Amino acid sequence: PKLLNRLNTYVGSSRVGKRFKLAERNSTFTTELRAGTATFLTMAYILAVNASILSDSGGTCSVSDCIPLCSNPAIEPSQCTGPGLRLIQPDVSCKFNPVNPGYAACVEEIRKDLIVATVAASLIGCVIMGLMANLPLALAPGMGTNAYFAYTVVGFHGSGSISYRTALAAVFIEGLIFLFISAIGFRAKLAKLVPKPVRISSSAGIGLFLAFIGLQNNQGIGLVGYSPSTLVTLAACPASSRISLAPVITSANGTVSLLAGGSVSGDIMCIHGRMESPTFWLGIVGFVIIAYCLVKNVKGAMIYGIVFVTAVSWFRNTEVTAFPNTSAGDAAHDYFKKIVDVHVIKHTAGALSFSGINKGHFWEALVTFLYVDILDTTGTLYSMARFAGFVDEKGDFAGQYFAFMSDASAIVIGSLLGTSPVTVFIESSTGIREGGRTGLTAITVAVYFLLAMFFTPLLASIPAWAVGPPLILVGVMMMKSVTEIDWEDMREAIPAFVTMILMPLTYSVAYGLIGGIGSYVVLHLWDWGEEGLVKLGFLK
């Protein structure tokens, strides 16, 4: 026949072929590799997006890495010695604008570290899923939880109520509890705990949250900025025309002064030149490219858009350059000059700490992690089992037990390595749609991830206007779940709308879920009471 056919048959007739039940599932070797390659092309974008989002979280280092600065910027701190000249001792404000150089270097190092951590976690998760449960699924850090971890639990540059290490501890404990409950089979009861409309609309809320994040400044293509009256208006003015804000003390005559201890914000206000930022238009070009590649049903759209924007952004003397002419820019260009490197985890490894188990926000974050993971994992796993045609009449696909256990173990390992919890990817559908049916798909994707590493230097130079449209379009894809809501029934409509609008506005998933559940319960209280009272017997 053909060498492809000899290879297929030889693998099919081997012990390893029987291990994964190749013959019984009607595919031998080459369908598996094609499915794996398609899956990797579909979901490679995590490699950049997750690293960027987690790097913006501030990393493991604190004010201790802020160097003392001079009184005048023109004098370097080492030479800051003279009359009326002194050194400023770093404070909390060193972490924020204007950022201390030491913190910037720490942040870049943590960015590299997190890239490597993501790659390793995804590889190990894929291997475990492929081997223990023997299914053709792919695992990697979740998009929905990335931003919740980076911008809400920890905050921008560690401005949140939970320290990074305690956040990793929370993720670890959540993974352990998930493994426990999956083992003892209470999972269905907890999944039924949440009301239907909140469960349906939480995904749309998270999609809107990601879309909003993609429209900010230090996360995406700009186009949204501060306004003194409406608090949000049309950004995308040139970077040279952006200024910061500070808190002041008003009065009853018109005087104003700066409030000591004001937490200065970044460049968020535009003074002139709206809709003139070249980075915004480059991001728009990338967005349109990804949109076409999606509409024509071409796999790997987001990678093509990201790569085009990044390649354009690698030139050195442009307005959209990823290497601006300063010290940090020169260091970044130096690193990017070497194409391949083997970076080694140094700080994020084993960075757990159980100090903050007392704080309420700790348990809030843990419970939010737990519920999001339970619901999404169960739903996506059952959907993919349906897509592969493994579901029997009773509704189970045999190997569900070990699939859930493997997902929980992967979550725990990701927690240990220092990344947001890992999950199964809907992108795996592509592999199923290509004919792959056994665990070789997962191992192929794992090998492709292992190939991805060795390229840390190139993946470290992704600007926000490259991340951008990927996040926006992930939100677009996630929004499709709104249809399952009966919008004509107020008792079901109101909680869903609250859930959708609270997440992107309060900028926090937990508050959206809490508001939705509270509104649902308050609305249904009368029905609960009447039903229970008729059950008692006073009413009919």
Ligand X SMILES: *[C@@H]1O[C@H](CO)[C@@H](O[C@@H]2O[C@H](CO)[C@@H](O)[C@H](O)[C@H]2NC(C)=O)[C@H](O)[C@H]1NC(C)=O
Residues at the contact surface with ligand X, assessed by CB under 6 A: 71-73, 251, 253, 255, 257
Question: What residue has token string 């109520």?
Answer: 161
Closest by Cα among 103, 135, 122 to 49: 122
Span of 35-43, 115-123, 240-248, 416-424 interacting with a second copy by CB under 8 A: 240-248
Q: At what angle do helices 3-12 and 30-42 cross, to 10 degrees?
A: 100
Q: Is 494 in the site for a second copy (CB under 8 A)?
A: yes
Question: CB 115 → ligand ZEA: shortest distance, Å?
Answer: 18
Q: Which of 13, 14, 71, 325 binds a second copy (CB under 8 A)?
A: 71
Size of the site for a second copy (CB under 8 A): 84
Question: CB 69 → ligand X: shortest distance, Å?
Answer: 9
Residues 77-96 binding a second copy (CB under 8 A) are: 88, 93-94, 96
Q: Which of 508, 509, 513, 516 binds a second copy (CB under 8 A)?
A: 508
How far is it, in rounded angstroms, from Cα 72 to Cα 77?
Answer: 9
Burial of 265 (0-12, 13-18, 19+ CB in 10 A): middle
Q: Which does 10 bind (CB under 5 to 8 A by kind): a second copy, ligand X, ligand ZEA, none?
A: none
Q: Which of 11, 132, 177, 493 binds a second copy (CB under 8 A)?
A: 493
Q: Which of 215, 412, 413, 445 binds a second copy (CB under 8 A)?
A: 215
Residues 6+ apart with CB under 8 A from 267: 97, 217, 239, 242, 243, 244
- Measured from the CB atom, is 3 or 252 closer to a second copy? 252
Q: Is 233 in the site for a second copy (CB under 8 A)?
A: yes
Q: Which does 427 bind (CB under 5 to 8 A by kind): a second copy, ligand ZEA, ligand X, none?
A: ligand ZEA
Question: CB 537 → a second copy: shortest distance, Å?
Answer: 24
Span of 128-136, 173-181, 207-215, 532-540 interacting with a second copy by CB under 8 A: 207-215
- Measured from the CB atom, is 459 or 485 closer to a second copy? 485
Asked if 170 contacts 369 with a C-beta cutoff of 8 angstroms, the reply is yes
In DSSP notation, 281-302 reads: HHHHHHHHHHHHHHHTT-TTHH
Question: CB 368 → ligand ZEA: shortest distance, Å?
Answer: 11
Asked if 201 contacts 503 with a C-beta cutoff of 8 angstroms, the reply is no
The residues binding ligand ZEA (CB under 6 A) are: 142-145, 203, 206, 372, 376, 380, 423, 425-427, 478
Residues 450-479 binding a second copy (CB under 8 A) are: 473, 475-476, 479
Terminal CA-CA length for the chain: 77
Q: Is 288 in the site for a second copy (CB under 8 A)?
A: yes
Q: What is the distance of C-alpha 37 from the center of its chain?
A: 23
- Measured from the CB atom, is 487 or 528 closer to a second copy? 487
- Measured from the CB atom, is 37 or 100 closer to ligand ZEA? 37
How far is it, in rounded angstroms, from Cα 275 to Cα 236?
Answer: 5
Q: Which does 203 bind (CB under 5 to 8 A by kind): a second copy, ligand ZEA, ligand X, none?
A: ligand ZEA
- Residue environment code for 424-449, b if the CB has 16+ CB neighbours within 10 A, otherwise e: bbbbbbbbbebbbbbbbbbbbbbbbb
How far is it, in rounded angstroms, from Cα 30 to Cα 189?
Answer: 41
How far is it, in rounded angstroms, from Cα 236 to Cα 221?
Answer: 8
Q: Is 22 in the site for a second copy (CB under 8 A)?
A: no
Q: Which does 62 bind (CB under 5 to 8 A by kind): ligand X, ligand ZEA, a second copy, none?
A: none
How far is it, in rounded angstroms, from Cα 135 to Cα 394?
Answer: 19
* Whole-number Cα distances in Å, 485 to 253, 439, 497, 501: 53, 36, 10, 15
Q: Which does 505 bind (CB under 5 to 8 A by kind): a second copy, ligand ZEA, ligand X, none?
A: a second copy
- Measured from the CB atom, is 215 or 322 closer to ligand ZEA? 215
Q: Which does 216 bind (CB under 5 to 8 A by kind): a second copy, ligand ZEA, ligand X, none?
A: a second copy
How far is it, in rounded angstroms, from Cα 212 to Cα 219?
Answer: 10
Q: Which of 16, 319, 491, 534 binds a second copy (CB under 8 A)?
A: 491
Q: Are strands 139-141 and 224-225 parallel, antiparallel or unpaired?
A: unpaired
Q: Is 30 in the site for a second copy (CB under 8 A)?
A: no
Q: Is 257 in the site for a second copy (CB under 8 A)?
A: yes
- Measured from the CB atom, is 14 or 71 closer to ligand X? 71
Q: Enumerate the β-bridge partners of residue 234.
A: 224
How far is it, in rounded angstroms, from Cα 256 to Cα 250?
Answer: 5
Asked if 117 contacts 55 with a C-beta cutoff of 8 angstroms, the reply is no
Q: Is 539 in the site for a second copy (CB under 8 A)?
A: no
Q: Which of 12, 155, 324, 399 binds a second copy (CB under 8 A)?
A: 155
Q: Is 426 in the site for a second copy (CB under 8 A)?
A: no
Rounded to the nearest 5 degrees, what angle is found at the Cα of 148, between the Cα atoms of 106 and 133?
A: 100
Q: Is 252 in the site for a second copy (CB under 8 A)?
A: yes
Question: CB 255 → ligand X: shortest distance, Å?
Answer: 4
* Whole-number Cα distances in Å, 453 to 36, 55, 118, 342, 450: 17, 17, 10, 8, 6
Q: Which does 47 bind (CB under 5 to 8 A by kind): ligand ZEA, ligand X, a second copy, none?
A: none
